[PDB]
Each structure stands twice: as structure tokens, then as C-alpha cells.
Amino acid sequence: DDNHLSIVTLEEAPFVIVEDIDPLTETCVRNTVPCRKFVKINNSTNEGMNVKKCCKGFCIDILKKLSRTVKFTYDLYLVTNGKHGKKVNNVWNGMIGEVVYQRAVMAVGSLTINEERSEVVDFSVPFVETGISVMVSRGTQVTGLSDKKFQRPHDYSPPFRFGTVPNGSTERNIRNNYPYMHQYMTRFNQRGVEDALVSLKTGKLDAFIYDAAVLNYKAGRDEGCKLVTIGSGYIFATTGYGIALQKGSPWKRQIDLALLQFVGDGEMEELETLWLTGIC
Amino acid sequence: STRLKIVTIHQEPFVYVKPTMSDGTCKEEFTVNGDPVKKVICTGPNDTSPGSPRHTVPQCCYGFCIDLLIKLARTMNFTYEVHLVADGKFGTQERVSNKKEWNGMMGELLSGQADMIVAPLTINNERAQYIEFSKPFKYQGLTILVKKGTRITGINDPRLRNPSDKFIYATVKQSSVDIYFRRQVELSTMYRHMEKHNYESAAEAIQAVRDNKLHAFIWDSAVLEFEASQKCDLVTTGELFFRSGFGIGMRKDSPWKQNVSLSILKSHENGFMEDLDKTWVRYQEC
Ligand SMILES: O=C(O)Cc1cccnc1C(=O)O
């Protein structure tokens, strides 16, 4: 039915957290919802199986509220072709690609609104503020993205060691804005956020440039509160996470009004306190 | 076709409003960074006392939102004429009777007196039902302005939450902040206090704090932090107790809406919005 929607998401704590289902009873309990993940049998076949999992987190709570207020049901699945979204040889992968190519009616998760994505999908109003921030060890003297240590790295001996996790909105922005910085940085590409935090804590990296909302959450949970974001939490290119819909979607209007009602009624601040607050 | 009718509102540092010179032109000035200030002629009422006739005259407008307007008009290649909202208000929907009407810039956009709102206009559910908002050109929130040396912890302070006539606080009439306090029943105690004291404009409330006639002013942090950076007798307290953004406003049938939003996103991403911050918002510090 037209009221039962295919929805794609991506694991990224604390926005989307994936757990195993109880083998018995094979049912999702507590604050979790069913979500499925296509898992390959092997690398010499296209055969796979949809493994039943359970999903929770900030964006899952938003989805549950939207489901109730906007009046839809959904079949939630985890993207397996890439991550948030990157255009490769003019073809979008990740959550963006699932929506563009009509495999999902919407994408719900830690999906950053930017200009190039907005050309191929519609975005809801932002429901979580984000941007580009810089994580360092407390006390590191870095003004921001425009710091000369980033812009002209080889003016320093030894040079500053900094990197990102490639293929998302952050790398796209640096590639477009700071060509020399970008080509320098790629030798410090990090395979994921957990690797980057280990490189910082152990002195292999001086700075980690990445999504503000994620970095703020990791800073709040850091053991010893040693890792911080620069500028009392400054953000370049402020934007937000948004729900991605197909261009011209008939769901956008009510989704937007619902999100704005949650914000205006204090419901969003509750989810922030539930999922995003940290000790530090 | 036709030139876009732009409506805006006085609200420093986003929109400055000054008299024209004797010859009808705007005096040449330079920003804090030495660049010429771009100014546009904006017509609007000089008299603003409630319940009086509105005499419109050409005036000079400039600031963060005017720079943004000029950028949008260059990018999308439209012409425009700017005017100041006749009733001086941002816009709320009020009961008359069982009918409801929009006032402020909201009312002008919906009636066709304007085609686009370019102003520090807060995106909220109430307005979004009626008009199209761009993605936010500025992320900010609400905070509280007080006279330096006034001690309150923020929105949960007992002098706000258990109020009396000894400590008066308020916001601007017919504004998004008025809507916010009226909507939430958990704020009803504060709303009933503020309703007795709300001001016709942000400038008047800020001056009232300076003059010890208003003890706290609840308003947009993008404005209040700017004032506190410029006037050392004023401070904010409690940091943001609620987050929101400003957006460009258009009718739902506007042919411009897609490209306005893409232009806003592009400007955040290429540093243009940060340039505007450095020019208009973040350059003093006490
Ligand atoms: O910031 C990145 O490069 C990747 C990323 C990280 C966290 C949330 N969103 C995204 C995204 O590209 O949408």
C-alpha cells in the first residue's frame, strides 16, 4: 500500500545503533525497531540474505514519532552500497543513491544537507545542527579550517598531521574549497571514526576534521575528556542533518511540519538529552 | 515580468535603517574591514507609534541581510525593490471572531504586498504551514539579555519561573518568541508575565534594559550577542535555551524557491556566510 514506505538508514552511533535480534524470540524489544541488512553469501555470487536486526537511537526515535504523526508504516533497511552518499562517475551511492534510484522513499539517519545532494533529492528541514569541525588534543593551537597549519601544511617543520574519513560531505567540501590542503590530507585518510580517535589519542594524528555533530558526541564521551573540538565548538559551513526524500515527494510537506512541531514543542531537546549529552 | 517586492525589518546587525541624505542618496561608508558598504533604498514608515497613520519615505538599508539579498539577486538574476514592513512586526497569526489573520512580514507576503521576506525571520511550524522557508541562512537560538551585574542563571531561574512585578522580563510583540511562549503550556506562567510587558520592537526593549526599565529581554541570540559585544553594560546569560534558524520566506507558488535554497547552501559551503559573519556580526568583543 501507498502508506507503507521503504526507508533506508545507516549505522552511526548515537543516531542509529544496530543490535542483534534475540535468536529467540527473534523479536525487537524495548526502544528498538526492526531493521534488515542484506549480507552476502560470498564474493563469487550475487546471492545474499536479509538478516533481521534491531535499530535504535536519536534518528530512530525521530522516525517513530514521524511514523505516528504523519501516519505511515515502514520497512527499515540498512544501506550496503556505500555510506551517507557520494557521486562516483556521476552515479550516487549510499543513502542518497537509495533514494535517487527509488529503492527508498526516504532516508533517515545522520545524513548531511549540502548543495550537491539537494540537486538530486529533496531534504526536510534540518533536525540536528552540524557542519565541519576539528577535533584535537586539548590545548592544541589551531584557529580553524583556515589555519595556516591546514592551508599551507609544508610551511611547518615538521608539518601538521591531519586527516578525515573520506567519501562524505566533509571531504567533498575540503576538496572544493582547499585544493592544496586536500591533496596533502589524503595520506592521513582514516578508515572510520574509531580509527581516527585512536590515531589522535596515541599521537599519530594532530587533528581530525569531520562532521560536527559526530565529533561533539565523541568529545562528550572521551575517556579523560582529553579530545575536544576547536573554538569552543566552532563549525564551518553550518548545516544540519535532514530526511532525504525523492524529488517532488508528497511526504515532504507533512514531514517538515511534523519536525518543526517536535522542535517547537520541546520534544527534540528531550531526544538530545537522551542520546547526545556526554559527561564532558 | 516584474521586479521582486522585498520586505524586511529593522534589526541590527542584520538590517540597519538610516535616513537618506538631503539629495535622496545614501552616504558612502566602509565596513570594519575597509570595504564599501552596499546600501539600497528601502521605503518605509518613519512614524511607528501604534495606532497612528504611517507616512512612508525613502530610507537607506544595509547589513547582513541586505548583503545576502544582493548576492541572491546577482546569483539568480532578478531585480528587486525593498520596503520596510508597514506595521513593524515579524509576524504572528492572531484571532480576530473565529477568523485568524497574519500580521507583520508574514501578512505582507501572504497578501502579495511582498514577494520575498529577507530578514532575520525564524523558521517555525506556524509560519511553515503558510509559506515556504529556505534552508536556514543562519543557525542560532534564544537567550536572555540583562544589564551587567544582574544575576540570573537562565531560563530556569526562579525569578523567571516564579515571577513577580519586582523583576520584569519580556520579548517583542508579534514575534516568533511570543509564539514560542504562547504555544508551550509549560511556559504559560512566563507567557502571562511577558504579555503584560512585551515591546513593539527589539531596539526599544534593548534600550529599556540599558535604562533599567526592563530587567531581562528574551530574544534571538544572533541579535543579543551582537548587542552585548557592542554595549559593555549589557550581557547575555544562560546560553541558548532553544535553537532555531533564520530563513528566506516566499509564497508556496514561488518559482524562485528551489534556487534560493541551493544558493543558501552554496554560500554556507564556500565561506560566503562566514564572510558575512565576519563583516556584520563577529568583530567587536568587549
Ligand atoms: O561528514 C562526512 O564527511 C560524512 C558524514 C558524517 C556524519 C554525518 N553525515 C555525514 C555525511 O556525509 O552525510
Numbering used by the authors:
A (entry chain B): 5 to 284
B (entry chain A): 3 to 98, 101 to 290
Paper text:
N-Methyl-D-aspartate receptors (NMDARs) belong to the ionotropic glutamate receptor (iGluR) family and are ligand-gated ion channels that mediate the majority of excitatory synaptic transmission in the central nervous system. NMDARs function as heterotetramers composed of GluN1 subunits (with eight splice variants 1a-4a, 1b-4b) and GluN2A/2B/2C/2D and/or GluN3A/3B subunits. Hence, GluN1/GluN2 NMDAR activation requires binding of both Gly and l-glutamate, whereas GluN1/GluN3 NMDAR activation requires only Gly. Each receptor subunit has a modular build with an amino-terminal domain (ATD), a ligand-binding domain (LBD), a transmembrane domain (TMD), and a carboxyl-terminal domain (CTD).
However, the electron density for the UBP791 ligand in this structure is fully continuous and substantially more ordered suggesting favorable binding of UBP791 to GluN1–GluN2A-4m LBD over GluN1–GluN2A LBD. En route to the above UBP791-bound structures, we have also obtained structures of the GluN1–GluN2A LBD and the GluN1–GluN2A-4m LBD in complex with HQA.
